[PDB]
RNA sequence: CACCAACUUCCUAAACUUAAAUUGGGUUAAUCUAUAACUUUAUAGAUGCAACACUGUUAGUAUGAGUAACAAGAAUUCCAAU
């Protein structure tokens, strides 16, 4: 079936400017207290989450170097230490990961 | 009609769905924090919880060992489950995982994203949301109300 | 064409005929060429008819400007502020003479559709009709079926 | 091709006299050749009409369309030049007066079909225009009240004349 | 006639502003640095005695302007619309900070000040109402209170439920107008001239002037109404969303004159409360609050 | 931003107040429910006697499920279980206001949470001093049978042996084709049919050049109000307020239904034997048995049936 | 026991009498040349001398339509990695 007539610019304006087809405004945008960048209420902050993932990559890069190959997963717990820190008694017999930089303020 | 169907349709079929979930579960055990699409991580969350239940049964149980063998493709991780993760969650009765929604992926498909992890890991803490302190204006008024009712019978 | 054009009501500039009639045309300008076939008829008009027209109408100031020209033109201006312009290219003396007389009689008001031929500011002497005219009153001003 | 939007930034008015309201500033900015359809860009340009700069930038940051990112960068440059070149005091004191999309110069190519046939393909482009005006956004629209509606109706009845008579 | 007092008081209030404004000639630049957590290291160069903390928030973005209720200039709370004086360090406080104690008091004072303005213009012009003081009560108390002494002819009359509702409708109309909280620090001499009629006001003014090394007293005006203040106040009256005049209690030891204390509650737009939660808090705000 | 933002009850609640507010609301429900337990000692409206042509109020119940049942002849009947749960009378209209010849009463049931409701509804319930209800419906009642608002109703309002009417929303099946929706035959599977198996045939005749209004076509099915007429009552459980009704009732389990006595011609004036205004346990003239039965019903714990 | 109703007819001003192939006559848009004119004109001599319509030719832009249709296995410590 083919169109029997051309549709006019007036009719076309009514189809594509209908309120059903317009972009809706958002009411759930807020500012992040820690960084001051914007976020949605039900979603994690992107800027703050970006910090954590960067550190996570560094730790995992170090973990890869120590193991030296695949199929080398330890059977004991893991822990991370930064320069100026030494293992406690409770830390005995647990894999230790060493980072050159100092302990990040946010990391506890 | 899909009344009462508790599974999503994923992959190339029923068998393909299991294999996709198995790969995500194996990655979670090794790394303990993972990013997937929100729908896929939500489907895999259930299996992650039940795996910690078989681990609790113990190394010597024949059924537990068979189940662990199937669901962990890399075999260096079966010792980890029975001797690291299972001891960690001895006290709790559940709620071993934490899952949160992440900003949409910036890769031209704009997928809804999530991050799923096991509680108690060694990684830097996630930036979770905190409730308001009791020092705020609304909290104080409710605290005042609580004290009066408690003290006055 | 009526729906495609503007319209107005019949009027006069300043109540022209009440106390005294005043002629609305006040200025004429005519431009000529000394030696150009197109403006020959206008030249004869200046030779014969221009002076006589000025005397009969003393309230109009007339300007005649010979200069090198391609089309002879006439400009008429009125008291209310209207301006009208006419080309006189290659016209006879009789044509120009009759054209000038029309301009004198006109008032500068626009020539467009006039809604009505007649205009009155005091349409009624005995009072305009309203529904209560021709309706009898009633005793005590009782509306129908009111008991009292 | 016409480039008039650019030159609008170079108008100079004479100094204002002491007894006169302070004239607000105006900024015109655009980006010309963009690999995006103008029909699609319209929906984005329409949304931010009338809003302040901060509210506009907030809504753009969480839209998934490719056009949203391009509009945001144009908005940021307009804000920067407003303070730097047009003597605007406060960054936040700005609202979007005008925003619209326009057609660009396009390209023609071939699109293949299944019996040795073909069709004509267009690679489409568009422009984006904005005008920034200093000051808080003007107040929104208030629908007519019931009393306001009635007052118009009496006015209509009072205007009646006796038609086609002396 | 009360109208006379409002007119003359405004005139003196306006005159004092002009005098201080004329005192500052030309423009002087003051370096003020942002010490808050976010956007750290920004430096605003501002005009002395004209620019305010709110103008600083204007430079950054509109999120600061809407959400910031107070500022800490060198560790002291400053009204958002109160002009700055010298180079300093600045920080902005909001209702949701971890320690909003300072903000809570400032909001609490402003609501009471609104309550007093409603009282004076509510009653018939015949009777005489004089405002005595605004007590300082912790938010835990459950309501903000205002003390007022009414006319002798009213000593036998207690407000009905419809009367209390009328006061709330008046208050809600004051919020709709969205008026700023103006601020003045003026020598005690001018304050006494502005409150000579109110004996209670006069003595209070003396107490505050005595405490400070100089005779500086804090005056605040919303619309026509003027009053002395214990501290900083909310930038505007639009901050409030929920407002209620709970009840009125007659103080027993009131032989010479009958002192009636009006109690109310309010919540800001930022911290709205659900329907049922609001009801419970209101009922607990109808019980007499002692000043401790 | 100087613009709108949305909130919900939990947004600003702190850790301690979160649990406290939950407990505070729960207690408020209990206090308001106990207060209404004594209607007869709360200025009840006058109680008129039964007259021919009288109509009585009904109840709102929740659909539990089904189970089997047997009669003294050994015939087996499937039955559905309806539980009355916090049913009160809410509002009364006089005959003239309702615009019907008869008056009307509104009933609510199944207490619900207060947190996610509009203010208008909460204000309406605060006036009546009751916690909100999930659903309201209207019943046509005569003047003699009018009951004061705020009076609880119970399952013993019905008694075994009477027929009843039930109405509820049916199960929703979504957008469906003509074969399932209207039982159209369809087309053959083989013998050369080309992409026409489950489709409708011709809509109408060619002459009219249009489609008649009301033509049967694909569309959304289910999720509509339906009524079942003439269902007998087999037994009542006073302790748990359970009614047993013959046969099937529309809707899924855990769905609210409307129960009223039958309007069929045969059972025109059976209301005389039943409690005329309603059943009041507050009167406490006699305590009812835990289980009420019908004579034909074979109760459990009776000796095995012998068809002697 | 009448009224209403067609430029038929009368009245003020004018006019001087009834579909179409084909047939007889008065003007004129545009451009060039001769001779003039000088904000675009005159008398003559000329011609590739006038397009709402040929499923006309060429170029441009719409409609159908933002529609039909098109595409990259998973996680990570990263695309000649595991
Ligand atoms: Mg239409
Ligand atoms: Mg489902
Ligand atoms: Mg095309
Ligand atoms: Mg059966
Ligand atoms: Mg369904
Ligand atoms: Mg078949
Ligand atoms: Mg087939
Ligand atoms: Mg037809
Ligand atoms: Mg004729
Ligand atoms: Mg013809
Ligand atoms: Mg030709
Ligand atoms: Mg053609
Ligand atoms: Mg198109
Ligand atoms: Mg279509
Ligand atoms: Mg489609
Ligand atoms: Mg498709
Ligand atoms: Mg593929
Ligand atoms: Zn953040």
Question: SS in 3 state form for F36-105?
Answer: CCCCCCCCCCCCCCCCCCCCCCCEEEEEEEEEEEEECCCCEEEEEEEEECCEEEEEEECHHHHCCCCEEE
Nearby residues of F228 by Cβ (< 8 Å), 6 or more positions away: F165, F166, F167, F247, F248, F249, F250
Q: Are E74 and E88 spatial neighbours (Cβ–Cβ below 8 Å)? A: yes
Alpha-carbon gap, residue A21 to D70, rounded angstroms: 21
Q: Tell me the shortest Cα–Cα distance from B108 to chain D, in angstroms.
A: 8
Q: Is the CB of A74 under 7 A from strand G?
A: no
Residue C132 token pair? 């209560």
Residue A35 labelled as part of a binding site:
yes
Question: Taking a C-beta distance cutoff of 8 angstroms, is the pair F78, F88 a contact?
Answer: no
CB F209 within 8 A of CB F54: no
How many C-beta atoms surround the C-beta of residue D156 within 10 A?
A: 8
Single out the residue of F84, F33, F36, F79 nearest to residue F258, CA to CA. Answer: F84
- d(CA B73, CA B23) in angstroms, rounded, equals 8
Give, as one character, the DSSP assignment of residue B84.
Answer: I
Q: CA B10 → CA B4, B38, B49, E211, distances in Å?
A: 17, 13, 20, 76
Tell me, yes or no, if F189 comes closer than 8 A to chain D by beta carbon. no
CA of F210 to C1' of G36 (A): 79
Subset of residues 52-81 in chain C with CB less than 7 angstroms from any atom in strand G: 68-71
Phi–psi pair at D95, nearest 5 degrees: -140, 160
| CA nearest neighbour of A66 among A83, A52, A49, A79 | A79
Q: Which ligand is in closest contact with the Cα of F246?
A: 4
Q: Which of B's residues 87-116 have CB atoms within 7 A of nucleic strand G?
A: 107-109
DSSP 8-state class, residue B106? -
Neighbouring-strand partners of residue F71: F297
Candidates D60, D52, D47, D142; CA nearest to A21 is: D47
A14 in a known ligand binding site: no
Resolution in A: 2.9
Using C1' positions and the CA of B26, the closest nucleotide is G75
Distance in Å from G24's C1' to A70's CA comes to 113
Q: Is E63 in CB contact (< 8 Å) with chain A?
A: yes
CA F188/CA F179 separation, integer angstroms: 13
Q: Tell how far CA C116 is from the center of its chain.
A: 16
In the numeric block, which tokens belong to residue F302? 């009776």
Chain A residues near residue E39 by CB distance under 8 angstroms:
36
Question: Quick check: do F and A touch, 3+ CB pairs under 8 A?
Answer: yes
Do E148 and E262 form a contact (C-beta atoms < 8 A)?
A: yes
Beta-carbon-side half-sphere exposure of residue E239 (alpha carbons within 13 Å): 26
Interface touch A22/D47, C-beta < 8 Å: yes
Q: Residue E124 is encoded by which pair of tokens? A: 């018939």
The nucleotide whose C1' lies nearest the CA of A21 is G66
- Token look-up 């920004």 returns E42
Inspect the structure and tell me whether chains F and C have 3 or more CB pairs less than 8 Å apart. no
Q: Any atom of strand G under 7 A from CB of B23?
A: yes
Yes or no, beta carbons of D52 and E62 under 8 Å apart: yes
Question: B136 beta carbon < 7 A from strand G?
Answer: no
Token representation of residue F30: 């209990």
| Closest CA–CA distance from residue E64 to any residue of chain A (Å) | 10
Q: Is A64 on the interface with B (CB under 8 A)?
A: no
CA C74/CA E166 separation, integer angstroms: 80
Cβ atoms of residues F298 and F305 within 8 Å? yes
The span from the CA of E89 to the CA of E159, in Å, is: 49
Give the position of tokens 């109509």: F55
Q: Is residue B81 a contact partner of residue B91, using CB atoms and an 8 Å limit?
A: no
Nearest bound ligand to the CA of residue F193: 7
- For ligand 2, an ion, list residues with CB under 5 A: B 2
* CA–CA min distance B106, chain D (Å): 9
Cα(first)–Cα(last) distance of chain D, in Å? 60
How would you write E73-106 as a 3-class SS string? ECCEEECCCCCCCCCEEECEECCCCCCCHHHHHH
Chain A 16-55 contacts with nucleic strand G (CB below 7 A): 16
Q: CA D69 – C1' G13 distance (Å)?
A: 77
Interchain pair E58, D90: CB under 8 A? yes
Residue from E260, E264, E291, E270 nearest E150 by CA: E260
Write down the residue that tokens 């030891």 correspond to.
E253
This structure was determined by cryo-EM
Question: CB–CB of B91/B70 below 8 Å?
Answer: no
Which bases of strand G have any atom within 7 Å of the beta carbon of a protein residue? 37-43, 60-64, 66, 72-78, 82
Distance from the first to the final alpha carbon of chain A: 69
User: Looking at CA atoms only, how far is residue F1 from chain D in angstroms?
Assistant: 7
Q: Could you tell me if C129 lies within 8 Å of chain D, comparing CB atoms?
A: no
Q: Which nucleotide is nearest to A69 (CA to C1')?
A: G82
- Which residue matches tokens 């609001």? E278
Nearest chain D alpha carbon to F3: D55
Is A101:B124 a contact under the CB 8 Å cutoff? no
Are the C-beta atoms of D53 and D94 separated by less than 8 Å? Answer: yes
Dihedral, CA of residue B134, residue B140, residue B144 and residue B149, to nearest 10: -50
Would you give the distance in Å from CA D113 to the centre of its chain? 40
On whether the CB atoms of residues F141 and F102 are closer than 8 A, the answer is yes
Helix or strand run (H / E) with residue C123: none
The residue in chain E having the minimum alpha-carbon distance to the alpha carbon of residue F4 is E269
Helix axes D66-85, D53-60, angle to 10 degrees: 150
d(CA D163, CA E274): 63
Does C50 contact strand G, using a CB cutoff of 7 Å?
A: no
């Amino acid at each position: 079936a083919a169109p029997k007539n051309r549709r006019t610019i007036e009719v076309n304006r009514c189809r594509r400017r209908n309120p059903q087809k317009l972009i809706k405004i958002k009411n759930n945008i807020d500012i992040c207290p820690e960084c001051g960048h914007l976020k949605q209420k039900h979603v994690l902050c992107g800027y703050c989450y970006e910090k954590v993932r960067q550190e996570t990559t560094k730790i995992r890069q170090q973990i890869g170097a120590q193991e030296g190959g695949p199929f080398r997963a330890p059977s004991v717990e893991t822990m991370v230490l930064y320069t100026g820190e030494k293992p406690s008694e409770k830390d005995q017999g647990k894999r230790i990961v060493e980072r050159n930089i100092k302990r990040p303020s946010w990391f506890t | 009609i899909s009344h009462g169907r508790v599974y999503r349709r994923l992959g190339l079929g029923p068998e393909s769905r299991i294999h996709l979930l198995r790969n995500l579960l194996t990655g979670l055990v090794r790394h303990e924090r993972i990013e997937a699409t929100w729908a896929r991580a939500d489907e895999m969350r259930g299996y992650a919880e039940k795996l910690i239940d078989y681990g609790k049964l113990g190394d010597t149980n024949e059924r537990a060992m068979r189940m662990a063998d199937f669901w962990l493709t890399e075999k260096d991780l079966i010792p980890k489950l029975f001797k690291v993760l299972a001891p960690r969650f001895q006290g709790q009765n559940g709620n071993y995982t934490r899952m949160l929604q992440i900003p949409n992926r910036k890769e031209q498909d704009r997928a809804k994203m999530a991050v799923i992890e096991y509680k108690g890991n060694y990684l830097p803490p996630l930036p979770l949301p905190h409730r308001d302190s009791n020092l705020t204006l609304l909290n104080q008024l409710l605290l005042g109300l609580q004290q009066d009712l408690h003290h006055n019978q | 064409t009526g729906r495609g054009t503007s319209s107005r009501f019949l009027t006069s500039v300043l109540h022209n005929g009440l106390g005294r009639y005043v002629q609305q045309l006040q200025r004429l300008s005519l431009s000529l060429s000394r030696d150009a076939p197109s403006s020959r008829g206008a030249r004869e008009f200046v030779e014969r008819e221009v002076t006589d027209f000025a005397r009969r109408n003393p309230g109009v100031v007339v300007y005649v400007n010979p200069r090198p020209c391609a089309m002879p033109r006439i400009v008429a201006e009125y008291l209310n502020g209207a301006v009208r312009e006419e080309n006189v290219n290659s016209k006879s003396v009789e044509e120009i003479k009759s054209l000038v007389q029309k301009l004198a009689d006109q008032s500068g008001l626009d020539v467009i559709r006039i809604r009505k031929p007649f205009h009155t500011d005091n349409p009624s002497i005995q009072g305009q009709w309203h529904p209560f005219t021709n309706k009898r009153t009633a005793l005590h001003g009782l509306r129908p079926r009111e008991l009292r | 091709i016409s480039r008039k939007w650019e030159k609008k930034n170079k108008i100079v008015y004479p100094p204002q006299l002491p007894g006169e309201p302070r004239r607000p500033a105006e900024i015109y900015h655009c980006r010309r050749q963009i690999k995006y359809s103008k029909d699609k860009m319209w929906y984005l340009a329409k949304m931010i009409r009338g809003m302040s700069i901060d509210q506009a930038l907030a809504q753009l940051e969480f839209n998934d369309k490719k056009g949203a990112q391009i509009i945001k960068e144009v908005l940021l440059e307009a804000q920067d030049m407003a303070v730097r070149d047009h003597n605007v005091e406060f960054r936040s004191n700005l609202h979007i007066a005008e925003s619209t999309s326009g057609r660009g110069q396009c390209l023609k190519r071939i699109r293949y079909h299944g019996r040795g046939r073909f069709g004509i393909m267009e690679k489409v482009y568009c422009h984006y225009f904005v005008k920034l005006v200093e000051g808080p956004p003007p107040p929104p629209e208030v629908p007519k009240t019931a009393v306001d509606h009635a007052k118009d109706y009496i006015q209509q009845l009072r205007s009646r004349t006796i038609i086609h008579t002396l | 006639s009360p109208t006379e007092l409002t007119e003359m008081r405004n005139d003196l209030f306006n005159r004092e502003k002009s005098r201080q404004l004329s005192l500052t000639p030309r423009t002087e630049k003051i370096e003020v640095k942002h010490v808050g957590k976010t956007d750290p290291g920004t430096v605003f160069v501002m005009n002395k005695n004209i620019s305010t903390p709110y103008s600083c928030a204007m430079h950054l973005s509109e999120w600061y302007c809407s959400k910031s209720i107070l500022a800490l200039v060198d560790g002291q709370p400053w009204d958002m619309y109160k002009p700055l004086t010298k180079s300093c360090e600045i920080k902005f406080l909001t209702f949701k900070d971890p320690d909003p104690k300072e903000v809570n008091k400032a909001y609490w004072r402003s609501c009471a000040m609104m309550l007093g303005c409603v009282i004076e213009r509510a009653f018939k012009d015949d009777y005489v109402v004089s405002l005595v003081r605004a007590p300082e009560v912790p938010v835990i108390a459950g309501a903000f209170c205002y003390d007022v002494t009414l006319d002798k002819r009213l000593d036998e009359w207690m407000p009905t439920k419809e009367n209390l509702r009328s006061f709330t409708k008046d208050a809600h109309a004051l919020i709709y107008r969205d008026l700023p909280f103006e601020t003045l620090d003026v020598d005690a001499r001018v304050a006494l001239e502005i409150f000579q009629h109110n004996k209670y006001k006069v003595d209070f003014i003396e107490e505050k002037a005595s405490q400070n090394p100089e005779r500086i007293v804090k005056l605040h005006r919303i619309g026509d109404f003027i009053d002395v203040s214990e501290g900083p106040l909310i930038p505007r009256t639009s901050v409030c969303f929920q407002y209620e005049v709970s009840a009125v209690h007659n103080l027993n030891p009131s032989q010479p004159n009958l002192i009636r204390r009006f109690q109310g509650l309010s919540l800001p737009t930022h911290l709205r409360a659900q329907f049922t939660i609001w009801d419970k808090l209101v009922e607990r705000s109808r019980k007499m609050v002692t000043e401790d | 931003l100087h613009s709108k933002s949305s909130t919900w009850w939990d947004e600003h609640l702190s850790e301690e107040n979160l649990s406290f507010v939950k407990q505070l609301v729960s207690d408020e429900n209990k206090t308001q429910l106990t207060s209404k337990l004594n209607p007869l000692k709360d200025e009840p409206w006058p109680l008129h006697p039964w007259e021919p042509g009288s109509f009585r109020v009904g109840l709102i119940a929740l659909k539990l499920g089904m189970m089997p049942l047997w009669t003294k002849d050994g015939q087996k009947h499937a039955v559905t279980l309806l539980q009355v749960q916090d049913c009160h009378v809410l509002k009364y209209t006089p005959k003239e206001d309702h615009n019907g010849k008869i008056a009307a009463l509104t009933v609510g049931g199944k207490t619900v949470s207060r947190f996610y409701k509009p203010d208008s509804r909460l204000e309406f319930y605060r006036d009546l001093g009751l916690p909100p209800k999930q659903i309201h419906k209207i019943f046509h009642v005569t003047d003699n049978a009018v009951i004061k608002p705020g009076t609880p109703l119970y399952a013993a309002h019905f008694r075994p042996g009477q027929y009843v009417d039930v109405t509820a929303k049916t199960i929703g099946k979504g957008f469906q084709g003509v074969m399932k929706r209207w039982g159209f035959k369809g087309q053959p599977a083989s013998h050369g049919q080309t992409k026409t198996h489950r489709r409708p045939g011709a809509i109408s005749t060619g002459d009219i050049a249009r489609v008649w209004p009301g033509t049967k076509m694909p569309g959304r099915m289910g999720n509509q109000n339906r009524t079942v007429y003439g269902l007998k009552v087999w037994r009542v459980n006073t302790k748990h307020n359970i009614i047993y009704v013959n046969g099937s009732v529309p809707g899924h389990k855990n769905c609210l239904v409307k129960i009223k006595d039958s309007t069929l011609p045969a059972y025109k004036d059976s209301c005389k034997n039943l409690p005329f205004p309603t059943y009041f346990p507050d009167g406490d003239e006699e305590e009812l048995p835990e289980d009420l039965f019908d004579e034909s019903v074979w109760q459990p714990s009776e000796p095995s049936i012998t068809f002697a």
